RNA sequence: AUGGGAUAACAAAGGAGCAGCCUCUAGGCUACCGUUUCGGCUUUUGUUGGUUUUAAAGGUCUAUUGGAGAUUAUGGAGC
RNA sequence: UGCUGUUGCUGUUAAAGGGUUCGUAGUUGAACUGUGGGCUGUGCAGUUCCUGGUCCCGUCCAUGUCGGAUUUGGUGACCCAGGCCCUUGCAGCCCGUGAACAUUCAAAGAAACAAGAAACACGGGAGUGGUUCCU
């Protein structure tokens, strides 16, 4: 009973980044898994991927480089409108300066950063610092 | 009208190019009977366009489209033809596509549940290059995804295969993209049951 | 020293079928020749089954629980995969 | 896990990646699709059609020669059966432990075992009429 | 055992049966019956001349298993029959 | 390499090693957290000039990939021969 | 009220429980609605009331003009 | 007072998992239809041509088996390199695309056509539009 394939996912890269492992090897890969990667990629958090076909549901085989803290989930995928990046950025991220938290808007998965200037809400997915 | 006119498409009868005759004749000298097993299939069959591609390397690419129709067919002969119809054309390489519409994205929730998942692009794309690589199979796939923002499929042949289409790769590739507007790269792989991409 | 995404021959030999990378079957046709009559049936590696030759009806396998006994010295061949 | 009872056990069939037919396939696709309806009108289900062309006529899988599974080909041709299978095979099990416990009315082994499997019935049974493959009336009885 | 239970479902979807004892005499007096199948609590003398017919006109009698009650659920019906003649077979071998 | 005033004055107390194959920060309380100093060589077997150190940090000795860790290294860096 | 369409929800489906090929022209026939009984009716002919014809329209039958086709009819099947 | 806990509690032993299983209201629920391209100028990363600083080949020795040197060595190997818009990816900018594929080419995709489109096309009203609007 995999409800969430992000939960699944994220904590993978998370318990494997703890244990200062090279590569991860996550089960089931998704549209929005992905998404989600390409975000932690962006900003230097994750190597690379490979994304494996089973004709079912892929493989994603995600090289760490050592610059993660953490990934969450954040499960029941609360709401941000514009002027509430300032409760996430509180509750959840350690600093005003490093952290980000990840959401899905109209135009798709973003930062809070690439949200604020853009000026779209949207609903809160995880976070990474 | 000219008796090997009827193997292409009736607009295309009229007023065929120098390109489009100079097949619908080799088709219709192994329609007519020379070529053992395509005395079988030679004649309800049709072709479409067909266009010359050229890859920035050496040889160019005849891309020989026919309707979807005739899938079933061809996929008996697709040997025999492309070898047969290279003779009769030396110095490019001839491929076979079949033409295909593609739905685009509806939307609309409700419209969504409504397409043919044949006509979506994904499964398009995909049989263009079974089209391309046939009778070789792709073992693999896997999307390399790079620091740059850069997505780039790999598709992986057999090994066994390595001998015949080693050489037609690079113009596969490119014909792909100018097909599709996405790009392939292709690597062999031994034992494709336990993935090994092969070196040697 | 070892990819998660390419691994060594050594590993992946051992691992179950559905634990693979790949997922695949761990089965195949064999191409079989009655000894009774000189005739040839495909067989499939886990018969679970009784598979009888076509001219003579001769139960060419045992049904037995993991893979498929063949019968009496009848002849077996490895079909491909493809 | 596993729908009622504690096994958590894992086998099954791992199908390939490759769906091309073998090249020593030499049977047309019209020559399956009447193999099934042949040994259909046997009295015969699908999950069984499969295996005596694997076994014996070695065709893997169905859908990848025949463009279809064992049932459109069933389904096209009017010879599906009138209870989806993995329903008959229940109500199979069902009857013959109510048969068995008529003499047997201390053996509380299976009295137990019939309570999970009638619950199945009743969760296919739901799933096979909102799913309209059920006369919406069906019951067990 | 049952694997008769299994060839009377065939039949049923298949071929032409006769339910009964004294409509299926009539199958046996024009020889158009290719199996007679008997219940356990069918009475002798009805036995009797089934069987006897059965052995005038060569058709090959199956003495069923159980009840006429359990008899004819097997051919799923909701009454009983005590006798039972197939008229022809289906794919069912006999 | 540290968090700089808006005037550009570095502002860091000490700016901490990071392990070569965790890439951790080696905290000041953190004893085990090793240097190990491979002597660089040159054509006919002369010890010349050698600058390459690896760090590790305190956690990844304790559990025995130490070792694992520097041949990991060492090939990486080429001060080893992979056959 | 109006943009956005990533994530979601509602509804429908359950796959033989189906399913429209388009097009040039020619001909033939043919009211059109409505029903409980006499009912309704499109412009033009100067106008209104009454009658009637011709004509398109649609339909339907036959005729072949050009082209398609997401599944090979010069094909499968049986003699 | 995070001692009512959505943010935010606790439940082996401190207070607290029903004796087990089935199960309705209820809550939760797997993957998929989807990297659009090309041209210009400019920032990044990964085969022409030039190096001789390597290993391989070879030579001289022969050294029973842990010397070596040898020049040209050797299109071999390799390398540090180049304002090669020949490379590919990628950042940013301009800008074109009926823009996958097919299909059209008439005065500039017009018309047909493909795609989309009910915010639409298909016929119609002078009691429509400040006296029936525009070219």
Redesign the pocket.
């Known amino acids: 009973?995999?409800?969430?394939?992000?939960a699944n996912a994220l904590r993978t890269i998370a318990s494997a980044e703890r244990r200062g492992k090279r590569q991860v090897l996550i089960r089931?890969?998704?549209?929005?898994?992905?998404?989600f990667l390409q975000v932690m990629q962006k900003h230097g958090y994750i190597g690379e991927f490979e994304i494996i076909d089973d004709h079912?549901?892929?493989k994603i085989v995600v090289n760490l480089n050592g610059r993660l803290n953490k990934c969450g989930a954040i499960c029941?995928?609360?709401d941000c409108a514009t002027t509430d990046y300032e409760?996430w950025m509180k509750?959840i991220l350690p600093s005003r300066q490093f952290g980000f938290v990840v959401?899905?808007?109209?135009?798709?998965?973003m930062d809070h950063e690439e949200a604020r200037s853009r000026n779209?809400?949207?609903?809160v997915?995880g976070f990474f610092y | 009208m000219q008796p090997h006119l009827?193997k292409?498409?009736?607009?295309?009868?009229?007023?065929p190019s120098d390109l489009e005759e100079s097949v619908a004749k080799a088709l219709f000298e192994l329609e007519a009977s020379h070529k053992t097993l395509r005395q079988?299939?030679?004649?309800?069959?049709?072709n479409?366009?067909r266009?010359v591609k050229v890859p920035?390397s050496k040889k160019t690419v005849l891309?020989v489209?026919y309707?979807?129709?005739?899938?079933?067919?061809?996929?008996?002969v697709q040997r025999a033809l492309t070898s047969e119809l290279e003779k009769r054309h030396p110095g490019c390489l001839v491929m076979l596509?079949?033409?295909?519409?593609?739905?685009?994205?509806?939307?609309?929730?409700?419209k969504?549940?409504?397409?043919?998942?044949?006509?979506?692009?994904?499964?398009?794309?995909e049989?263009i290059l079974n089209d391309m690589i046939y009778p070789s199979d792709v073992v693999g796939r896997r999307?390399r995804?790079?620091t740059?923002?850069?997505?780039?499929?790999k598709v992986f042949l057999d090994a066994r295969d390595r001998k015949r289409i080693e050489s037609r790769l690079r113009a596969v590739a490119y014909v792909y993209?100018?097909?599709?507007?996405?790009?392939?790269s292709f690597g062999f792989m031994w034992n494709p049951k336990l993935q090994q991409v092969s070196t040697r | 020293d070892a990819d998660l995404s390419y691994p060594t021959v050594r590993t992946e030999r051992m691992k179950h079928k559905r634990r693979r990378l790949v997922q695949g079957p761990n089965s195949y046709f064999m191409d079989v020749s009655c000894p009774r009559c000189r005739q040839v049936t495909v067989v499939y590696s886990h018969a679970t089954t009784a598979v009888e030759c076509k001219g003579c009806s001769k139960k060419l396998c045992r049904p037995t629980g993991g893979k498929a006994l063949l019968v009496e010295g009848c002849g077996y061949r490895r079909k491909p995969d493809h | 896990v596993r729908?009622?009872?504690?096994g958590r056990g894992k086998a099954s069939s791992a199908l390939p990646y490759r769906r091309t037919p073998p090249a020593w396939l030499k049977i047309?696709s019209?020559?399956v699709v009447k193999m099934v309806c042949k040994s259909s009108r046997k009295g015969m289900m699908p999950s069984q059609i499969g295996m005596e062309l694997r076994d014996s006529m070695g065709i893997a899988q169905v859908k990848n020669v025949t463009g279809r599974k064992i049932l459109?080909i069933l389904?096209?041709?009017?010879l599906?059966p009138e209870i989806p299978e993995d329903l008959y095979f229940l109500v199979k099990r069902a009857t013959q432990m109510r048969k068995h416990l008529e003499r047997h009315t201390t053996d509380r082994d299976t009295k137990?075992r019939l309570?999970?499997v009638?619950?199945?019935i009743?969760?296919l049974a739901?799933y096979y009429k909102?799913?309209?493959?059920?006369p919406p009336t069906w019951k067990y009885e | 055992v049952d694997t008769i239970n299994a060839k009377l479902q065939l039949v049923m979807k298949s071929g032409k049966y006769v339910l009964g004892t004294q409509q299926a005499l009539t199958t046996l007096r024009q020889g158009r019956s290719k199996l007679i199948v008997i219940s356990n609590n069918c009475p002798p003398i009805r036995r009797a001349e089934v069987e006897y017919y059965c052995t005038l006109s060569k058709t090959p009698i199956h003495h069923y298993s159980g009840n006429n009650l359990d008899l004819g659920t097997a051919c799923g019906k909701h009454f009983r029959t005590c006798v039972l003649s197939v008229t022809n077979v289906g794919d069912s071998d006999i | 390499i540290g968090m700089f005033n808006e005037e550009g004055e570095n502002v860091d107390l000490y700016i901490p090693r990071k392990c070569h194959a965790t890439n951790t920060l080696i905290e000041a309380h953190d004893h085990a957290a090793v240097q190990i100093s491979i002597a660089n060589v040159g054509?006919?077997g002369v010890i010349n000039g050698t600058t390459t150190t690896l760090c590790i940090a305190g956690y990844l000795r304790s559990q025995g990939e130490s070792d694992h860790a520097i041949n990991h290294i060492t090939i990486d860096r080429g001060i080893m021969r992979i056959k």
Not at chain 2, 148 to 153: E, R, T
Not at chain 4, 3 to 6: E, K, L, P, Q
């Open positions: 009973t995999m409800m969430s394939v992000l089931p890969s998704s549209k929005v898994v992905v998404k079912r549901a892929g029941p995928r609360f409760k509750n959401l899905t808007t109209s135009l798709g998965i779209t809400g949207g609903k997915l | 009827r292409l498409r009736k607009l295309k009868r009229g007023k079988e299939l030679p004649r309800f069959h049709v479409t366009v266009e920035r891309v489209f309707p979807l129709r005739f899938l079933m067919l061809v996929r008996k596509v079949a033409q295909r519409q593609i739905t685009k994205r509806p939307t609309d929730v409700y969504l549940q409504k397409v043919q998942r044949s006509k979506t692009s994904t499964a398009v794309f049989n999307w995804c790079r740059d923002g850069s997505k780039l499929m993209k100018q097909l599709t507007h996405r790009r392939v | 729908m009622h009872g504690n047309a019209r020559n459109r389904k096209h041709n009017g599906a137990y309570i999970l009638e619950s199945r009743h969760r739901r909102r799913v309209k493959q059920l | 054509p006919n």
